[PDB]
């Protein structure tokens, strides 16, 4: 299996960017396998 990388862009902040998405506040847990889960 050939895993490889190819460049995709410069790491830059865009000055006139779309602001979108909400800002949820969530109680979560993290297990030893690196998986997040919601608490409830």
């Amino acid at each position: 299996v050939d895993m490889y990388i190819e460049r995709a862009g410069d790491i830059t902040w865009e000055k006139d960017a779309e602001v979108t998405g909400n800002s949820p506040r969530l109680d979560v847990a993290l297990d030893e396998s690196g998986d997040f889960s919601l608490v409830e």
Partner: protein, 151 residues
């Protein structure tokens, strides 16, 4: 070569399995993207140097170099690199993952699996973490932790 930038992680026709960041001669991505497998870069080989499945992170060529942190206040940009699409900046105000071991910034943006590893930026262009380890909420949408390592 290891020139600074954001990169697609591909397997071979080819499939995009993720994304990562080259900085200071070190490639940074999420563990679930590569599972620590070696990466071809042009004619060269990049070998895994450090990783942690619980953080879901892995670095190649050297130690984790990204140390900028979300200030808990400001908007950020996801530099999304989705499979088959050009890189694009998405600005958002992060939410919060509240955990028993402190709070983690988290972004409510939804992209294909192979967008995993796309960098999250502060206003100065510093990488404050990588996108793609998160949770699914009741309405089916997605919230990603702003996952940052320790330098």
């Amino acid at each position: 070569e290891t020139t600074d930038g954001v990169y697609r992680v591909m397997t071979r026709g080819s499939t995009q399995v993720g994304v990562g960041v080259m900085q200071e001669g070190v490639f940074h991505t999420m563990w679930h993207v590569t599972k620590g497998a070696a990466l071809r870069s042009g004619e060269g080989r990049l070998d895994p140097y450090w990783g942690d499945v619980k953080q879901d992170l892995v670095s190649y060529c050297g130690p984790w170099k990204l140390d900028a942190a979300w200030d808990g206040l400001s908007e950020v940009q996801l530099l999304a690199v989705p499979p088959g699409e050009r890189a694009k900046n998405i600005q958002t105000l992060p939410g919060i993952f509240k955990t028993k071991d402190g709070d983690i910034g988290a972004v409510a943006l939804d992209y294909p699996a192979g967008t995993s590893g796309s960098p999250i930026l502060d206003k100065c262009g510093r990488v404050i973490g990588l996108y793609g380890n998160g949770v699914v909420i009741k309405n089916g949408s997605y919230v990603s932790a702003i996952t940052q390592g320790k330098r």
